Symmetry: D2
Subunit: 377 residues, 4 copies
């Protein structure tokens, strides 16, 4: 039961996705390249500043709107959904919450209209162990020198803004981790070739290297040493976003597959009429239902200002795990055609597999959930 605005935004995104994205899904996947038409369409439609204030060109909508947009996009293409998720839930939120009036006035208008941001936390030696990051920041008078590397950076290929976590004092561990706003065009910053991936292929995923990258002191986001707090704070909200992506992906796969099994006839009946298959369908539908409830409930808790971290982890864990199961089963229900790239279900399957890995792997979600359970008893 959504507000009028939430319902309108959902219907608008559904139309946009069907008309502007669906025709391109296959070719974007094949060539690991999101089309400019889609990217600029997202900005044009106000989908890159959903919660940002209108004064900065934002839509001014609710967090649940962002969730419904992510879900609705992912029903067509999970790659476009995460592209939208990163901008809204990681980049925009961090700048909204911790930016100075100066930083907000500068960056938010660009971020709602044409500039793409990348969230730069992970390194080769700091994946699940994010706070072991070795990218360092040395204060030299009016600027900081950044040295290190990042790995797996989503949207980096054409990003203009990099939100970079770097340690200003490695002798104090994670409490030296600080957030920096870094412009693309700066000596020493290199964005490498996008990875060649199993799925999520249209979402660029690039290595970064920082060779004596110089960042003005005014480009520190928030307080020195609090960057670890901002990283995991934004990722707590990001887990709801990834729950929504995984949900939408799984739903889109399911929605496509049921009409097929209704129409396909073997042994004189609809595939849907074999009870073994009906039971698998019903089991999966129940899991999709549970996933949707967990995702929306986490979102509503966040909106209400209630504790939501355990619930966000629960949604991301469950939705990502059941998206793997849903997509795997849909290929089977389709049979042979499901194994071919002429049908969409094999892409949903390839895309879903990422969900149990990024924004905190499944084991990490369970660790977080257990910590919360320990504190409740």
């Amino acid at each position: 039961t959504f507000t009028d605005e939430e319902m309108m935004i959902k219907s608008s995104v559904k139309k946009f996705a069907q008309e502007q994205i669906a025709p391109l899904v296959s070719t974007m996947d094949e060539n690991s390249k999101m089309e400019k038409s889609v990217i600029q369409g997202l900005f044009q439609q106000g989908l890159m500043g959903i919660e940002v204030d209108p004064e900065y060109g934002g839509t001014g909508a609710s967090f649940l709107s962002t969730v419904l947009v992510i879900e609705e996009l992912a029903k067509v293409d999970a790659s476009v959904a995460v592209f939208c998720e990163i901008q809204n839930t990681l980049i925009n939120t961090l700048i909204r919450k911790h930016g100075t009036e100066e930083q907000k006035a500068t960056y938010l208008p660009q971020l709602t209209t044409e500039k793409v941001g990348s969230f730069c936390l992970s390194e080769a030696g700091a994946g699940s162990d994010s706070f072991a990051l070795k990218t360092r920041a040395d204060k030299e008078g009016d600027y900081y020198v950044l040295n290190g590397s990042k790995m797996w950076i989503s949207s980096a290929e054409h990003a203009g803004l990099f939100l970079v976590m770097a340690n200003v004092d490695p002798t104090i561990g994670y409490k030296g981790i600080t957030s920096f706003l870094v412009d693309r065009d700066t000596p020493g910053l290199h964005i490498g070739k996008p990875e060649n991936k199993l799925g999520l292929r249209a979402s660029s995923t690039c290595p970064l290297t920082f060779e004596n990258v110089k960042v003005p002191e005014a480009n520190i986001l928030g307080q020195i040493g609090h960057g670890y707090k901002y990283a995991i704070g934004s990722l707590n909200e990001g887990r709801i976003g990834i729950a929504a992506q995984m949900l939408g992906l799984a739903q889109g796969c399911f929605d496509y597959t049921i009409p097929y099994i209704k129409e396909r006839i073997q042994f004189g009946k609809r595939l849907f009429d074999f009870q073994g298959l009906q039971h698998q369908v019903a089991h999966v539908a129940t899991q999709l239902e549970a996933a949707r409830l967990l995702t929306y409930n986490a979102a509503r808790l966040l909106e209400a200002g209630k504790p939501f971290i355990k619930e966000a982890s629960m949604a991301k864990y469950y939705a990502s795990e059941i998206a793997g199961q849903t997509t795997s089963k849909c290929i089977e229900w389709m049979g042979g055609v499901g194994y071919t790239k002429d049908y969409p279900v094999e892409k949903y399957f390839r895309d879903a597999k990422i969900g149990t890995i990024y924004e905190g792997a499944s084991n990490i979600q369970l660790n977080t959930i257990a910590k919360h359970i320990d504190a409740e008893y």
Copy 2:
């Protein structure tokens, strides 16, 4: 708002039941299980606390609360004793609802004040040859003057040992199949009605479960509940609601089991660590917690859909299937997390395990839930 946000009345009712269960039920749980016998004090308490007429209008002695209140009461009772919870669920969700929905004004005035104050009802559908296939029931009702004569048998009748009222589904015209099935309000002490000995069961042992036989049982024509030949409709309609009620029971028992077990694994030490600090065990606990959360949301959402007058049958089936399946998994894992002590009757987790197993069988076995969900999915595409 979040699914766990309740009205003031819902919150107050939940709180009262928690207190009542802990004070009046918990000390008797073990004895009742051991002896397969519900205590009169507990039955009296349920009535005295208003828990047998939760949604019934205050004009008939009821509390006039929401359906979600009934769900919360069942859950809360089941955290302490699943057998007491089903006793409450049958009265509210099957018996009272059938009469509230399909009774004449005279029938409501006559039966509801008794059902809210002292009289227990039994729902009588199933037979030896008609379990999942309920509408193959062979109990027949033959019209003689202004009465019907009932002949046949029923099986698996819960609360029969104490019930004053039996809501009996019987066929008035077996040649038209299910469309002959009719609901009858049969009083306990009607000549020809025999209540057999209670089953010796794995769990839910304090809830009496008895066979019935009908030998020329005379029932006035006025004692038909609703329209002749619509008994099948009324039975399954009430069971659609009862499925949310069984979801609530399964949820509550799984939660009670889990809540008991976590403090133990935090306290118990092996290899110098709390059991809770073994990551394998932690992951299992977190996975189970997630399933409990999903089961809760499914159950409450089904209840809210029902309250909003929205379609709820698929969702009720989803809640019952899911809650019952994860109640089995939850209780099975809790025994393991407890270790050896979990396998003994000196601890409560083995009873929760035995009790949970019924949830995938009664009020429509799991396969039947899946068949129902599939029918709705086919209609949606």
Copy 3:
């Protein structure tokens, strides 16, 4: 494919179980009491000395014969099976392997004819962490004083011999653990009342208290400080025994249930003809087949003198887990009648649940398998 002797032993055990045990299963379960007639029959049939040399009244059979016997008994009553498994795989084996010729001459003739043995490792503070056992043994000239308590001792109510693990020097930790042959009627040895259990109810499970229990130095089994090794060695073999018990229990439950679902009619069909149910049955059958192959292969690896520990753990883990799944499903396939004590499937379900707990709980089995996988690469 088995040897002529293995086939003959299996066939005679099947007969003995159906004629002498089956009629008593319900009552033994209801009363939590093993019948003396059943115990006498086990000894009389040569089932309590399966691999013991004929010198000592044994049957002189193979280890796989012991596995087949435990499986066949468990098809009728898991409680009777474990009684047999403890005697053969834990007690007899330890005395055969580590006994002096005088100890063998004394105890093995008794253990094959009338005397029941109990294996005494676990304590309240030492279950999974067995080697944290606090029962101590002090040498006082020609004897050892044992002080402490044990928990969960199977067969204790009837046992004339207790094989006890006690620590002779706790500063050395587990390397002080030593094994002692203790006669029932020794002062200071108190056997508590049997546990009131969920299942395996006919197998007595008692606490023991050792208040200054004096064991002659002649009654040390093996070398001092090597008791930890004997304990876990016998338990490696015991794990194959419990796999066989769990296999038999699950197979007996399955074998009972299939005729019912073929005979029972709903909606004008045999229950067996509903495809959802068929698929569940076929899935369980596949797991039963896999559990059997794991159990027998582990047994053959032991007999061939090949490494078998990883394989024994895999068998016990898998067979116990699928015994729980099989019995849970069988109740569902039977419907209402499966939930009543008038039918046998609810007992199989209560009995199966102990399989993932005793003889090293599932998590411990997985830790062991992981240690071996670690060593293979």
Copy 4:
């Protein structure tokens, strides 16, 4: 003796294929996957190593080895590349077996020497309207003098791009249903036979999978393989063995993936620990190891049952179902254990994952395997 105790010849053949696969196949696996194109060198190499006539008698240029040897060759190949394994599986367990078991002495003398040395065969059963329902195939064979004229189409034909021989199931009398189905030996260069474009696939990409069409394809009556109208029996007979072959492929690919992943999780450090030392991950690994072990035993036992002339169809279905299902779970878990690198094509685990998914679909989808298993269980009680 344990199921992993082989004959000296079986051990020798396993070792030989391991060496061949590592030296001749491993370097090319990524290119073949990327290009969807099997390399000529690999196919030539399979023939040269004697891997395309494993069980064929030496009088026809075969090795005359055991069926378990074929299983071990398939397993060992799939550890490196499941596409190459299926290429070998079809030739040995479908094509060579059909002709060995049901060919005349003349057909054996003509075809087996070709098939053991240079000629690839395709097995042509499935159609767009006849997948799981194979025997609903509509390809017709009409008698015209001493010849049969084939008309229709096939779908999903593996190895078609390279095949010189097509074993085609066609119905000579559609009015008698499945009893009209007949196997035909059809040369690639027969007029009227057209091989369509290879499918663009999720995995198994180096194995060509093509549609066929038959326009008045004239076959001499001597080219019927076996008895007219028994082609349904021959086809499903060969598929019962092929199910053990696919079990072996799924087993080998899962094992290869597993074997690659364990050293990685031993060496990768996070939070100061090897990934292998996180107990949650350890338990997942141990669980997967147990499943692999169980799949191996099911696979080898089914093979040994077949060799002993014992009933093996239920066991073959159990092996294929179980191995395919756990290959999916194994490869899915390996990607997770690897983390980010597992999701990239620079590492080999994502290909195992994509390849494994075909296992639950071809050679009789999982549901069909369960149906077959159930039919045998019914006969046993």
